[PDB]
Amino acid sequence: GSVQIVYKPVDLSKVTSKCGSLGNIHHKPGGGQVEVKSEKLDFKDRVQSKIGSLDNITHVPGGGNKKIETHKLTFR
Amino acid sequence: GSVQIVYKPVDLSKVTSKCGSLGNIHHKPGGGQVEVKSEKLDFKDRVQSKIGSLDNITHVPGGGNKKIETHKLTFR
Amino acid sequence: GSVQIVYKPVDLSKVTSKCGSLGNIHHKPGGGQVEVKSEKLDFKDRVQSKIGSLDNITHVPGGGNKKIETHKLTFR
Amino acid sequence: GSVQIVYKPVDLSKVTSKCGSLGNIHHKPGGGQVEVKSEKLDFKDRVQSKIGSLDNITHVPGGGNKKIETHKLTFR
Amino acid sequence: GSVQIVYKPVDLSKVTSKCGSLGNIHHKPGGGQVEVKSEKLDFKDRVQSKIGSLDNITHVPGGGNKKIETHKLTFR
Amino acid sequence: GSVQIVYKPVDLSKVTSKCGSLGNIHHKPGGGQVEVKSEKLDFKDRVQSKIGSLDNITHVPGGGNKKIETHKLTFR
């Protein structure tokens, strides 16, 4: 017999920010020391890797807001 | 016999921030020391890895608001 | 028998920012020391890798807002 | 009446070192952070001064032996 | 009356070193951060000064031996 | 009456070194950050000064030995 699916998500959304000022922000790393020692690396599927980083990041977005959605229908 | 699905989420929402100022922020890492020692690194599926990192982050979003949604329907 | 799918997402949504000023942002790394030591690096599928980085980043977008959607339908 | 001084130190001496090896010496400072804040520095006679230094020294003399002597006579 | 001074220091001395090897010496400063802040620096006689230095030294003399002597006679 | 000074230092002395090898010496500074801030620098007599230096030195003399003598006679 008949199968009917009706799928309708309805979305109204706001991810919002109001800021009067971003500033006078200081990031001043005092150096640093790193050592890493290995024999063999063997990365076989979808691997994300960092080895021995000394990474300094300053990230000052006026917004930096995120909205993430997934919508999925599966039929058998 | 007949099968009927009706799938309807409805969303009305706000994820909001109001800020008079973000500021006078100091991040001053005092240096540092790291040592890592290994033999074999077999990573086989979907691995996220950090090894021996000395990573400094200053993250100062004016918003930084997140909204995450999943909508899923499955049928047999 | 008959199969009917109707798939109709409806979205009106905003990932929004208002910022009065971005400024006076200082990123001043005091150098640093990194060493990495290895023999064999076998990377076989979809691998993303960093080895021995000393990376300074300053990222200051006036917005930097993200909206991500995935819409998927599968039938068998 | 008559005054006689005879001033005669006699020195026979050795200040000696014998070493089979100096080596495999590692000095690896982990970075560091210094801040100094001042108004007025009035230095008036024979001052030796260091302010806000972050100085690293590795000093590995094969000898480094010291002999210091003063021989002094005063008459009125 | 008559005054006689005889001043005769006699020195036989050795400041000696024997070394089979100096080596495999590593000095690896991890960077560093210095800040110094002042208004007025009034230095008036014989002043030796360092301000805000980040000075790295590796000093590996095959000898580095010192002999220092002062011989003084004063008459009034 | 008569005044006689006889001033006669006698010295046989050696500041000596024997070294089988100087070598495999590594000096590898990881950079660094310096800031110095001032208004007035009034230096008036015999002043030696360093301000805001970032100085790396490697000094590896085969000898590096010192002998210093001062001989002084004063009459009034």
Swiss-Prot record, chains A, B, C, D, E, F:
Per-repeat ranges for Tau/MAP: 3-33, 34-65
Residues linked to a glycan: K44, K50, K66
Consequence of substituting S49L: In fatal respiratory hypoventilation; unusual apparent autosomal recessive inheritance; reduced binding to microtubules as well as increased fibrillization and aggregation
Compartment annotation: Cytoplasm, Cytosol; Cell membrane; Cytoplasm, Cytoskeleton; Cell projection, Axon
Cross-link (Glycyl lysine isopeptide (Lys-Gly) (interchain with G-Cter in ubiquitin)): K8, K14, K18, K28, K40, K44, K50, K66, K72
N6-acetyllysine carried by residues: K8, K14, K18, K28, K40, K44, K66
Post-translation changes: Phosphorylation at serine and threonine residues in S-P or T-P motifs by proline-directed protein kinases (PDPK1, CDK1, CDK5, GSK3, MAPK) (only 2-3 sites per protein in interphase, seven-fold increase in mitosis, and in the form associated with paired helical filaments (PHF-tau)), and at serine residues in K-X-G-S motifs by MAP/microtubule affinity-regulating kinase (MARK1, MARK2, MARK3 or MARK4), causing detachment from microtubules, and their disassembly. Phosphorylation decreases with age. Polyubiquitinated. Requires functional TRAF6 and may provoke SQSTM1-dependent degradation by the proteasome. PHF-tau can be modified by three different forms of polyubiquitination. 'Lys-48'-linked polyubiquitination is the major form, 'Lys-6'-linked and 'Lys-11'-linked polyubiquitination also occur.
Modified residues (Phosphoserine): S2, S21, S49, S53
UniProt note on tissues of expression: Expressed in neurons. Isoform PNS-tau is expressed in the peripheral nervous system while the others are expressed in the central nervous system.
Marked site positions, Not glycated: K8, K14, K18, K28, K37, K40, K67, K72
Modification N6,N6-dimethyllysine, positions: K8
Omega-N-methylarginine modification, residue list: R46
Record: disease: In Alzheimer disease, the neuronal cytoskeleton in the brain is progressively disrupted and replaced by tangles of paired helical filaments (PHF) and straight filaments, mainly composed of hyperphosphorylated forms of TAU (PHF-TAU or AD P-TAU). O-GlcNAcylation is greatly reduced in Alzheimer disease brain cerebral cortex leading to an increase in TAU/MAPT phosphorylations.
Domain comment as written in the entry: The tau/MAP repeat binds to tubulin. Type I isoforms contain 3 repeats while type II isoforms contain 4 repeats.
Subunit relationships: Interacts with MARK1, MARK2, MARK3 and MARK4. Interacts with PSMC2 through SQSTM1. Interacts with SQSTM1 when polyubiquitinated. Interacts with FKBP4. Binds to CSNK1D. Interacts with SGK1. Interacts with PIN1. Interacts with LRRK2. Interacts with LRP1, leading to endocytosis; this interaction is reduced in the presence of LRPAP1/RAP.
Entry function: Promotes microtubule assembly and stability, and might be involved in the establishment and maintenance of neuronal polarity. The C-terminus binds axonal microtubules while the N-terminus binds neural plasma membrane components, suggesting that tau functions as a linker protein between both. Axonal polarity is predetermined by TAU/MAPT localization (in the neuronal cell) in the domain of the cell body defined by the centrosome. The short isoforms allow plasticity of the cytoskeleton whereas the longer isoforms may preferentially play a role in its stabilization.
Protein name per Swiss-Prot or TrEMBL: Microtubule-associated protein tau
Protein's organism: Homo sapiens
Gene: MAPT
Shown residues in whole-protein numbering: 621 to 696 of 758
